[PDB]
Amino acid sequence: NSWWTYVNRWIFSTNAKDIAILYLLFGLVSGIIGSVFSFIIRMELSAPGSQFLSGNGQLYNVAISAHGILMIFFFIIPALFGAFGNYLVPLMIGAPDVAYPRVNNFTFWLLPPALMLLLISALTEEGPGGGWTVYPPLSSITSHSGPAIDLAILSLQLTGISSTLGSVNLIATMINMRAPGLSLYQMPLFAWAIMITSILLLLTLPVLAGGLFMLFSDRNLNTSFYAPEGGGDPVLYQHLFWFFGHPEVYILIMPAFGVVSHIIPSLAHKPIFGKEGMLWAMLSIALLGLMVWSHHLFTVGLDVDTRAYFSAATMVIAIPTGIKIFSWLATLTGGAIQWSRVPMLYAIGFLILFTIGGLTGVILSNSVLDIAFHDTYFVVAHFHYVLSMGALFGLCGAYYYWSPKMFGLMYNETLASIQFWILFIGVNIVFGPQHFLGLNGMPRRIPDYPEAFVGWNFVSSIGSVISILSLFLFMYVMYDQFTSNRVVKTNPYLIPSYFDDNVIFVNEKLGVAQSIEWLLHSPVHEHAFNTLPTKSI
């Protein structure tokens, strides 16, 4: 009877390896639903006027809000921040298991009920209509009558508290379970980044918890927390929300930084340039990304001195990121490059998209400049061309780079490269025309638009269609990899140097890697690190 063994190995199991795979699967099943939502909303705006629908604006609001919320909180955060950390951080720190296995098991299972209740909420008579950033007066019982947005508030609350509970054990694990002789300074860059995101998320999210609960209480207890007649100021709500929203994207994108800084050296066979400078600049970014929050409130009408104070500091964020990009550029040159490898392809494509997105972000960090682009399609282009080009590319590269370690299989290089090229072209021709659409002075979140905009929407729709074929090809390649029984060696990314004999290398050179995870067999043991690896003190 393997059924008891089945459910003990999967449900009543607390091993880190058996949980990250479920993290990836949950991320995938959220991402497919989100991609179809995005496809339907982009197909709505193919041409001006009501199209495929009876002009249902509330339905369009539900669609955009659902796409945003589910793809920002059910696709990227749970499938990148903790999915590739809980599996891999114990391997690089020198520990056999996380500090608290039971909380690690608990954190994962708070998400499925969140997804079901979010779907139920979206399946109400009205559904959430405040968008990704819901606002009190719109959310007020005056507009919505029913259990539509309350469940969305609850889902955000519980997902946030689960993510906070899913990050308490990680910090303890990587602060106390360090290897003998592994100073915190000598820690690998990826775990450095993941710990920075963990501490930032835990420090900031409680504020969201409290603010969201007090805002939600307005619908039931009739509190005057944000009522215009009750003495409440919604600018307080905006300040509370954007004390969280601004660093959230950084804590989402830092794992991409770490995975890129890990992918570049091994496939380049060259050590990373300036590790200490890079990590200290990233620490400066982490500390800096908190005191700037009011760039999302530029046209609300705050005072001149506050605007200058919180707009001047927006620029200084660029300097460490530019230093990081320059360091990666320097690392790429000189050393060998295998440009044909899929992780190398994704890492190379990440840099140009991230830097152009950063340039777009530095475009609109001025109160003098934001007035022409605030709440228009230009900010949509900026934030999309940063998010879906950095976090999605990092996730794809991490999957294609560490998949043999998760399972022990080989994918098809041809199909993977074709998928990468198709996805790159589609996402480049999707968010391209939106730059012009927002540069003309046309707002966002409008199912209908003035007639002199049809061409760029038509150009975007074809790329939106192409992205769906990219998704189909990725699904096919994942299935093929899962059922191809293609074996993998211990360290598939280790090759003999220019002066290694074919008989000396095979017998006196195997079992060497830049990181610990490649030392063990690709399907890792349940109980690894029986004895602690000891380095040079």
Binding site: K270, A318, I323, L329, G335, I337, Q338, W339
Partner: protein, 238 residues
């Protein structure tokens, strides 16, 4: 002033702040195009020539920054100062208030816009107010622009500066016009004070941006300049 087809630039407008905004945008774009093309060429060239089949030996023994990290810290920061300064003096020019002349009110509840000119209250005791409404598609005048016209169009004289008053009594709205480059938030309870100055005598277009429910996209805003005699005739007409 109005959107065109296959547009690449912003538009042709008329407002003292709009010209300065366009100038600053031109300078900032001149700044960033440099860095964008430089990084693109660097990424392309560092890989197209250094592939494995042509460079089987890697100079793995250079991982120290002697004088390069310092220049990395300075030069982009120099560019940052060079772009920050003009924006700073533009903002410090804009934050001042000129000599007030008259005010308008732009209160709007839901899917319609109400305007008031209560400066000219006198013995007649007839303050002027109306409501600008979305014109239906069927009743559009032959040759009209869909989704960008109103029935009771707003009227402001040219070359006269107005200290516009922004207020709302419902869910938050916004008051935007790309040609004039002036925007602020129709936040309920609190009034937002903004200015305006039209140089030409032409029809200007715009609408709200911050979503306010199902029909957030059904309140276009049209303001057109008029001469002094036309303005006086319009005022005495009602």
């Amino acid at each position: 002033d109005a959107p065109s087809s296959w547009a690449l630039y912003f538009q042709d407008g008329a407002s003292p702040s709009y010209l300065g905004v366009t100038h600053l945008n031109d300078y900032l774009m001149f700044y960033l195009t440099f860095i964008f093309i430089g990084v693109i060429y660097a990424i392309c060239k560092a890989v197209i020539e250094y592939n494995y089949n042509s460079h089987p030996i890697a100079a793995k023994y250079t991982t120290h920054g002697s004088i390069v990290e310092f220049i990395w810290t300075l030069i982009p920061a120099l560019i940052l100062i060079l772009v920050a300064l003009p924006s700073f003096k533009l903002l410090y020019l804009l934050d001042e208030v000129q000599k007030p002349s008259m005010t308008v009110k732009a209160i709007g509840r839901q899917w319609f816009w109400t305007y008031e000119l209560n400066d000219f209250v006198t013995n007649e005791n007839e303050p002027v107010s109306f409501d600008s409404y979305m014109v239906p598609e069927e009743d559009l005048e032959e040759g009209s622009l869909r989704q960008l016209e109103v029935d009771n169009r707003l009227v402001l004289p040219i070359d006269t500066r107005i200290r516009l008053i922004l207020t709302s009594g419902d869910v938050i709205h916004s008051w935007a016009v790309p040609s004039l480059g002036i925007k602020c938030d129709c936040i309920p309870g609190r009034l937002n004070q903004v200015s305006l100055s039209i140089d030409r005598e032409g029809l200007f277009y715009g609408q709200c941006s911050e979503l306010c429910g199902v029909l957030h996209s059904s309140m276009p805003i049209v303001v057109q300049g008029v001469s002094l005699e036309d303005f006086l005739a319009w005022l005495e007409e009602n």
